[PDB]
Structures are given as C-alpha cells and as structure tokens.
Amino acid sequence: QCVNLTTRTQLPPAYTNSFTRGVYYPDKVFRSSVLHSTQDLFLPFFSNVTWFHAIHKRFDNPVLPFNDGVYFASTEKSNIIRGWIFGTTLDSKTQSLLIVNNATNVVIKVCEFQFCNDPFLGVYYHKNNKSWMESEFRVYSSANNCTFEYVSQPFLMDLEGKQGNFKNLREFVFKNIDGYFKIYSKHTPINLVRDLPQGFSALEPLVDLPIGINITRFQTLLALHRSSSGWTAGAAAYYVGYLQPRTFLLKYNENGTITDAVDC
Amino acid sequence: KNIDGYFKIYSKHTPINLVRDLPQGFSALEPLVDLPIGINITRFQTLLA
Amino acid sequence: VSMTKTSVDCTMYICGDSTECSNLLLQYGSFCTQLNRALTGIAVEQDKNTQEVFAQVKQIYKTPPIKDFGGFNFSQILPDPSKPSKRSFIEDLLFNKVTKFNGLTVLPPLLTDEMIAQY
Amino acid sequence: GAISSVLNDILSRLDPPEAEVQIDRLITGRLQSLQTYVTQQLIRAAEIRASANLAATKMSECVLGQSKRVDFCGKGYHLMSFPQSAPHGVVFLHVTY
Amino acid sequence: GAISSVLNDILSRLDPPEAEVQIDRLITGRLQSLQTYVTQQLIRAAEIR
Amino acid sequence: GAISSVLNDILSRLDPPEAEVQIDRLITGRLQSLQTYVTQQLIRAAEIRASANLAATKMSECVLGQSKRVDFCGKGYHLMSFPQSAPHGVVFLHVTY
Amino acid sequence: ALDPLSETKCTLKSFTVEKGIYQTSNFRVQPTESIVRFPNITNLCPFGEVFNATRFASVYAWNRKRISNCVADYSVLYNSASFSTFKCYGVSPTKLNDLCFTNVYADSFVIRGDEVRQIAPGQTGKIADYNYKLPDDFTGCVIAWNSNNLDSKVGGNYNYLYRLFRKSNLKPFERDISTEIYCYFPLQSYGFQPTNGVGYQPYRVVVLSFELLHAPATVCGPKKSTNLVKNKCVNFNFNGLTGTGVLTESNKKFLPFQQFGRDIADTTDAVRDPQTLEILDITPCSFGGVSVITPGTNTSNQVAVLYQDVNCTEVNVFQTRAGCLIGAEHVNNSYECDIPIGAGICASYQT
Amino acid sequence: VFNATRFASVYAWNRKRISNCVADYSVLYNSASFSTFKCYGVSPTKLNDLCFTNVYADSFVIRGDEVRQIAPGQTGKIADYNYKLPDDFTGCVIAWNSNNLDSKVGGNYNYLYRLFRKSNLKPFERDISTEIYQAGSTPCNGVEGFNCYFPLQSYGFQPTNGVGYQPYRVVVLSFELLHAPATVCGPKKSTNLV
Amino acid sequence: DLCFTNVYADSFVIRGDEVRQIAPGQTGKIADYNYKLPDDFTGCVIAWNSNNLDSKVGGNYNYLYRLFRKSNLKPFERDISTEIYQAGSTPCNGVEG
Amino acid sequence: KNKCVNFNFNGLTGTGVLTESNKKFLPFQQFGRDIADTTDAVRDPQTL
C-alpha cells in the first residue's frame, strides 16, 4: 500500500506520434454509405501521445490526469492490463471507480477505496507447474460505502506469459459526459515493432456507467510475476493521450461500420 | 437646456463688426459645462449692469 | 433547359406532425401558401422551358428507309431504336456522363426524356 | 434560437406558453429557410429561362437555318448544327468552316 | 403571433412596456411581408426587363 | 429591435440569459440584412451578366465581323467596331454608314 | 368541404374555377395508432424477495435494502394478492411503475398491526417517531401481510426489537441503533405469538422509499410494451425514440449498440426494435399534392382528382405516372395536349 | 361582485353578468379596496378609458398559496382540477386578503375545492362531480380506500394562519371586446358629431 | 466590471406592501402618484426592513405620501402641491367634502 | 502600442491595435466614432 516497488525504475515520459488512433463510434446512430461530420472528444491525428511500458528493469504505473477523456492503447501478450482506477483525489475521501479484471469476471465497483501508491496484481512461483494465479491484491487495501457494483459473465482469461509478437491488442476510449461514463473498446491483431502502427481502428462502446462523479486522475493497472516489492514484469507497452473536442469526417461503408476518418 | 435633470450649457464667442441686429453666418456652439442641478426651470431673467 | 421541379409542402416542412405548430404557422397568414405558389410557378416555367426549346415543329419527321448521308456518317448522331431508351450513340454519353422524407416532392417534367429525344 | 431543433421535443417538454415561444423560433427560422430556397430558385430559374431562350435561338439559327451571327454557333463560318438531347438541357454540335 | 393585428387594440389594452411585445411581432411579420413583396417585384421586374 | 446594437454593452449589463434575448434580435436582424444584400447583389449580378453577354456578342458581331443586326451595333449600317477597355466593362466604337 | 370543386373554389378564393389543373391541397396520411416497443420487463431487483423474506431485521435496525440499476415492477405485487393490506401515500403503484428514481430503498421490518397504521407521511406514533418516519414528500407505498403463521412463536418471538423510547424524534429516512438509556431501556422486544389478537399479530411491512436526486435515475418502473405493427402508418415509440411513419422490415443491419439510424441529412430513416433484434426502415406516410383537373365553371362541373406521388389508397380508378387518378377515364388513344398533367400525360374534357 | 359578503366556492363558482350599465373604475382607486390588482391581458388603469361588450366576473375565494396557480398556461392543483383559465386568457386578476372576515374559528366550510381529478378540466368549465378519485385498479365503490380519495375538500381558514393560508377573495375579470355592441361603457358624456 | 458617469440614489421610506409597485410598468398609488420610475428605467431597486427603527409607537408622521392625484406624476419629480383631489364634477374649492 | 490588445479605457471596452492618432479632439470630446458609430479613437483618462 505504502511500499514502493524495488525493481521499478523511474523514466522520463517519452512521446510518440499517433496516426488515426482515437476514432470510435460516438453515439447510437447508424450510418451507412455516407460521409458524416461530427465534433466530440477525439485524439487528433499525428498528435503526441506518451509512451509507458513494463519490462523485467523499467516499470511504469504513473498517475495521469483524466480531464474530459483520454485514449488508451496497449500491446499485450499475457493480458498485463488488469484494469483502471478512476477518481478525483484517488483516495477514500471521495467516491472512486474501480474497473478490474481478475481473469474470471470484469468487476466494476464505485466505492471509497483505500489507495495504494503503486497498485498491481501479483502472481507467484511459476517454474514447473506454470501456475499464473492471483495472490496479492494491491489495487486497493479496503473498500467501503459502495454505491455501485457490476460483475460481468464468467470467462476464462489467459494469464500465461508469451514470447515473440504481441498476441493481444487492446485499445480503449474513456470519457465522462453529463455524468455518464463511456467505454469504447477495440481488439485487432497488429504487427508492430515500436511506437504505434499506421492503420485505422473504429472503437465500439461496451457499457454505459451512469455514475455521475468527477474524475481528475487515473491509473492503469498492471500485473507482476516472479518464479511485494521484489516482483518483475513481462514485456509489454502502452500509450496514453488526451481527447479534445475535435471534428472528424467519418466515412461509413455499406455494412454501416466506419471505414476511415479524417481529422478536420 | 435641461433634460432628465441634466442642465447643459453651450457657449461660443466670436468678434464681429456689426451695427445692429445679428450677423448672417453659421456658428457651431461648443459645450462649456454640465450641471447636475436637478431642478425645474420654468422662468429666467438676464443679468445686466 | 430544365431545372429540377420541386414542390415543397410548407406545412409538413415547417411543422412536422404538430397541430399547435400548424396553428402558430397559420398566424403568419399567406407566407405558407405564397411560397407554395412561387414554387408551383417555377415548376410551370420549367415545363415552358422544355416545350419552348425542344418543340420547334408540330410534326414528327422521319427519314426514308433509303439513307443517303452525302458521305457523312450519321449513325452516331442519330438515335438507335435498338436501345431501350431512344437516344443516339452520342446522347448515350450525354445521359451517362451527367446524372424526400420531409415533404419535398420532386415533380416529373411534362415531356419525358423520350419525348424530347423525339423532338 | 430554439432550445432544440426537434419539434416534438419542445412540444412535449415546455409549458404551453413556453412551448409557443420556442416553437415560434423554429417556425420563423424554417419559414425563412423555405423563403430563401424559393428566392434562390426564382433567380436561378430565370437563369435557366435565359439559357432556354438561347437554346431555342440556336435551334432556329444554328440547327434549322444558317447563322450569319458571328461566333453565335461557335468559331468558324457556320453551316448547320446537329442537336443532341442531354439531361436537363441540350447540346448543339455546330458544323463550322 | 400577435394577439391582434390592430395596433390600437394592443395599445388600448396592454401597458406601454407590454404592448411592445406584440407590436414587435407585427413589425417583424409586416417587414417580412414587405421583403417577400419587394423581392418578388424585383425578380419579376428583371424578367419583365 | 434590440436595446443596443453594441454586443459588449449588452453583455456587460444584462444577466447571461437576459443578454441572449437582445443579442438574438441583433443576430436575426443582421441575418435579414445579409439576405437582402446578397439577394440584391445576386439580382444585380444577373443584370451585369446580361450586359456581359451582350458585350461578348458585340465583340464577335460588331468588332470581329460585320453585323447585319439592326441597331445592335448602333445607328447606321455597321462596318466594324473598335473595342476600348473601361473600368468594370468595355466600350465599343462602332463605325457605321 | 362539399366536394373537390368547392375545395378548388376555396383554394383559389374565387367563385369561378377556370379550365385547367390546379393544386388544391396536400394529400397526407396521418398515423392510425400509437405503437409502443420497449425492452423486456426482465432485469428486476429482488423487491419481491424482500416482501416475501422469511425473517427481517429488528425494527430499530430496520433493513435498508438498496434497489438500484434495475426495473421495479410493483403491479406484480399489486396483482399477486399475496398481501393482507396495501396502502399507498401520494402515488399509486402504477404511477410508480411509470417513474424513474435515482435510488429506491426498501425499508423492511415486522411490526404489530396496531403499529402499521402509524406508518404514513408526516405522522406520529411508536414506529413513526421512535423508529422510522416517512417524509412529508414521501411518494412511495407501504405494503403489509399477516405473518402470524410464520414470524410468531409460542411464548413470544424475541428476534424482533423496536425503539419505544428516545430522547428526541428521528427525522425521515433516519436509523438510530444506539442503546443509550432513555430511566428506560429504549430497546424492547416484540411479543409475537400465534395466539395474539389481530392488533398484535406480526405484519411484514415494506416501506418503499423512492428518492430521486440530480444523479442519473437508475431504477425505473415497468413501461408496458405493445405488439409491433408493420406496413401501416403509425406513431411509434421505441425505447427512448419516437416518430411517425410506415415501419417495414429492411435489409439494414445495425450494430448491437446502435438502436436507430440517420440519413445523409441527419434524419431518422430506420430503427431497431428494442425487444427483438430486427431492423425496420421508416417509409414516410403517404403524402403528395392534390391536383384537381376541371373545365371552366361555365363549361362543366366534372372533376378529376389526382393524388400525386401516391398509389390509390384513400378512396373510374386509374393509375398514372403522376399518381392515382380518380374520376377520369384512361384512354389509350393519344390526343393533342389540352390540360397538361405531367410525365407525358394530359387530360381533356371530351365526349 | 367585489363588495359581496360571501363569494361562491372555487369548486362551483358563480359567474356574474355586467351588461347595460355604466362601469366606473375610478372608484376602485378613490376608495382603497383592492390589495392586489393586476391585469395580465389589459392595463389596470385602462379599464375606465376602454370599455367592453360583455363583462363576466368570476368571484370565488381560495387559499393564499393557491392563487399563483391561477393564470393562463399554468399547471397546478387549481388550474388542472377545479378552476382553469385559457392559455390565451385576456383579463384582470383581482385579489385581496379576507382573513379578517372570511376566517371562522377553525375553518370556513363554505369554500370547497377539487383536490383530485381524473383528467384536466377545460377552462371556463364547472364540474360538480364528487365521484371518488381512482388512481389504482381496485374499484372505489363510492368510498375512500387504496388509491381512492374523496375529491371535494374544504379550505382551512383560520384568523391566526400565516399569509400563505389566509383566505384571499379572488375575482377574475374576463371580457368580450368588439365582437358585439357595447352596452357597458364609462360615464363619458357624449359630444356633437362632426 | 462596468462603471457609470453620474449615479443618482433616491432614498425614501414606504409602507411594507407598497414595495412591489416600485419598478418600470407598475401601477399603484406609489408609481402613479408620489414616486414614479421611468418606463425605460435602468437601475436597481433596493429595500430592507426598518420596522425596528422607523416604527414609532402608534405612527411616524415624518413620512408622508400622495394618496390622491388628478394625473400621473412624472418620474423622479417632486410635486409639493396640496390642491384638494377632485373625484367628482363639483369643484372642491380647496376644501374637503 | 503597435499590438492588437484588449483595452478598457474609462469604461469603454474593445479589442484593437493601439496607435497614436493625429486626429485632434476638442477638450470636451472624448471618444471619437466612425461612420458605423463604432469607436474609432479613444483618449487615455490618466495621461491625456
């Protein structure tokens, strides 16, 4: 909770360029074989985003401002992204949102959480009998005054570490408008060396959380493993950028999905 | 003149060569002061020596 | 020659499915009807344009079955009856190269494309 | 200037005296919108009527007869014109010397 | 949109600050009526020209 | 119809919701002003376009060739015309018999 | 309104109608009925398993059961006949079924019958003042059922306590479990026994506290959906969207999160049914110009009615390229155009 | 109309006809009577200078906090149920405080109102039906019960109540203008015709 | 944020129920007779309760008002005339009756 | 001066480039106006 990691190394927030990232289906409107113009929170094209990554000597779990909305993109192998913490002060003094993945269900709760300076989820002693099972829970020490609880349907998440190319690609849009939290997700396999690949993806909404709280800070949750400050991290990388009230031209195909977007 | 409780004075002085009456020509008077006197003016007299 | 003939319903356009809105529109008097009369007059003038231009003769003229072009080749400029619509080989390029829900009605012209082609 | 452009949205929300005020803004704006459409169609219609008079004059002077007007039927000493129907118009093929 | 097209009705009923509301509606509407008349006369006049 | 024409004075006097009431009258009126200006200029543009088409016809018929059109190139039997540039137009010197 | 000739006279503002075709009105089909399609009545909260709960918390500790983010259908409990007495204050169960509230708190506890009459907005008594009070703006209901056969035991059932004394009065929606001595112990036990009289027999009392705040409303009552009607002009209300038109099954496919479509001009051209997964296009209800073809009043009163851009619906019934023409005979012989209609079709008054 | 001792109820109110007479409205300003005098459709001062054809005075008494619900376009327990004015209502609203007279000991039961109504009562209509208001599916059978409330309730009028609960005599002045010959006009002596 | 050239504060005392008549467009013995605001009035109306001070035993005769006036007093003007108000056609001749 | 700035001069608020004017106002004259009645030129109330 108050203990900081040992293998974690502090590094400067390097920046990278994004191409079309940040495009998502804004609302419930269906459009097909048309070119539509709309202004909402998007990530500008060729904008500067910030590069954080995790590896066995560099580990990144920074606190980043949420503002109106942010764009998240992660290249994963073991599904190292375990969730997000959203709050104003990131403490039990206010009402905070916890979205966590325990590899069984998606747990979304709004409570007063006891904040840890560097939250994560640990797994122990792999070697033979590959293990990969959760033990230590650092995402919160305790939770009280819960106003909201959501548990998704049972699923099997693969936590095993992998080598070579990235076997998972997860992109998200998080924004808060009129007291309604929006989550837009996309998963598509990519071929990437470093930075961000050039290509289009239209993120689609998952759920709508009518929570109605103010989020000024957030963190992205990660998992740590070793064959609780002495753990290590598997190779993965993720990027964070800020959404702005930008106007896009959304070109829709015959099926209704967005083919491409043009930043005004 | 006195309007809405604001008494305004416009003055002009130009030397002339004249026998009687008034000279024929244009004159543009300019304001002198603005007096918030806030009274009703229905009568007046001219002071002389 | 012709411009798209459009008849716009000023009641449905301004007031969609609303009685109270329609009453507030009637308070403006002839503004609704007068705009409909202007659009109607435009549509009539467009049919006048079509007839005053394409119709210069009161008869239909045809060549004899013996075709003597004086050495010229008129097969491209003359209509081909084999086509589903009566048009010449050049007019095929003319019509090919040059191409709602709220109460806007598209009025058909008085003389169809086939008729102006026969002129 | 209205709260919302949807007519039924204001009508189903505001009180009768308040809905009349905001709907009147929609009515005035939509009425002027159609009036501007009609005005533009009246002026453009006159433009099409002018080009229609030109097309009829070219059917008489270029197509039917021989044109003594200089460069009315195109460059060169005009002989005859072959009319060709076109969508919302007509094309004149002018044979000139 | 005014209560009455007659100006004397609005003037004889409503207070001065209250009469401007309906009179303004008559002015805007009658102005638009002049806009339609003059515009129609100008366009048709060009056609007559 | 607004209290004042200056936007900043209304904004610096009335409450935010009250200032929009008077600014709405300014915007609506200035919209009508632009509609009258644009419509008048478009109709006058058509008038200049008509005289422009006449000038082009006079460059072909009067200047370039000989015009048989009666009193089109001026009084008398037209011979040739000399064009002379002028501000926002053109002047034709028609030599007539 | 006499006949289409009088509609022509009134449109023209003239007693004499000249020979020709004149547009006298605008044909339109109004919606026949209102169609309501809403999502399934599922996703309920356990409000029936509170009322039907076997044992409750003590009355001083009255159980605050949070009802949030769900549907709350109280017409089932109203129509179940599973209650001995049901009393609402200010709003009926069906009206509550029509309202959304931010948080609904089911206050469950068991009290004596003579104590049940004490639970009403702004009243006084042993339960009202010393245990749980209903606010003056209380919009909910209170439902009770005689549990003497279950919640009572021989020699008294001491599992239920209540606050009899307090140094002051509790405010609405306030719970105080303090054992501080009032000198009297404020916490007393019930004497629930199968042989008690009606006034003292246990009743299972659920007070529904409906609290609506500025936060988004999570709990909504059931909104009864109706059957879906197609190929007819109707006024439809599908979830949160409404409109007027003719609903037909289309080939369009909306993504699972897209409930309604738009056109190039941002007009709603199609919808997705909230209950079943299917896409219906919106074809606007039949509309078009009403053209009256009639010779001069001095010639004849014969009238031909043309409904443009529509087939023969409302109603010498013939169809033209302009639309359904009724009152005029279709003649295959081609004549010189007298009264132009359109699309190469003209009408004339002949023998 | 105005100086009568006891007005009719707002549940069922008497409409008084003023016709074929001389209407002098300057007496209302000479002798101070009206506590609240406001004209929404006309000017309170121009009633004397402008005269009307058919004048209809609706006289009744209601609770103080119930007065604001009476106006064109408003919704409330008064406007929706017992007494409604049209949305285009053109007329004058007159009220003054009768707490010193109409208030009787614990209450004055001569003035009733409709607390419950199954629908929205149209303007200028009088519904005397006492049928039990049924908000639920259980039949009321003419008695009160679950979702069954007796709609005809009395105003509580006491001399010690606050200004919100004190009885206010309310007279709504409606008129018909220039739709008929004008029999009611002020005492303006006729002059010669030129 | 906005400042003015000449600021005029009118200080006076009225009966409690008479405060509502002080505003542009109001009608009453206040606005029509003793103290009137212009129809274009631009300013602020400020009042507070002095019952704890200005009230004296049975009455305070230092604060007078004009209950009767034959016409409408001009805004922000003081008429000290004591002429007897004439409600009828008979002249009052400076005495009550 | 010589920059576009937002000025508030003796209560007159506006946005413009401030440059020295050759126009001479009479001593009583303060804010000069152009054909459109907008503020054409100003006078600094502190240093004239």
Swiss-Prot record, chain C:
Effect of residue 68 to Y: In strain: 19B/501Y, Omicron/BA.1, Omicron/BA.2, Omicron/BA.2.12.1, Omicron/BA.2.75, Omicron/BA.4, Omicron/BA.5, Omicron/BQ.1.1, Omicron/XBB.1.5, Omicron/EG.5.1
Effect of mutating residue 105 to N: In strain: Lambda/C.37
Sites annotated Cleavage: 87-88
Glycan attachment residues as annotated in the record: 73
Cysteine pairings via disulfide bonds: 10-32, 15-21
Role description: Precursor of the fusion protein processed in the biosynthesis of the S protein and the formation of virus particle. Mediates fusion of the virion and cellular membranes by functioning as a class I viral fusion protein. Contains two viral fusion peptides that are unmasked after cleavage. The S2/S2' cleavage occurs during virus entry at the cell membrane by host TMPRSS2 or during endocytosis by host CSTL.
Protein name (Swiss-Prot/TrEMBL): Spike protein S2
Organism phylogeny: Viruses, Riboviria, Orthornavirae, Pisuviricota, Pisoniviricetes
Protein encoded by which gene: S
Entire protein: shown range: 729 to 873 of 1273
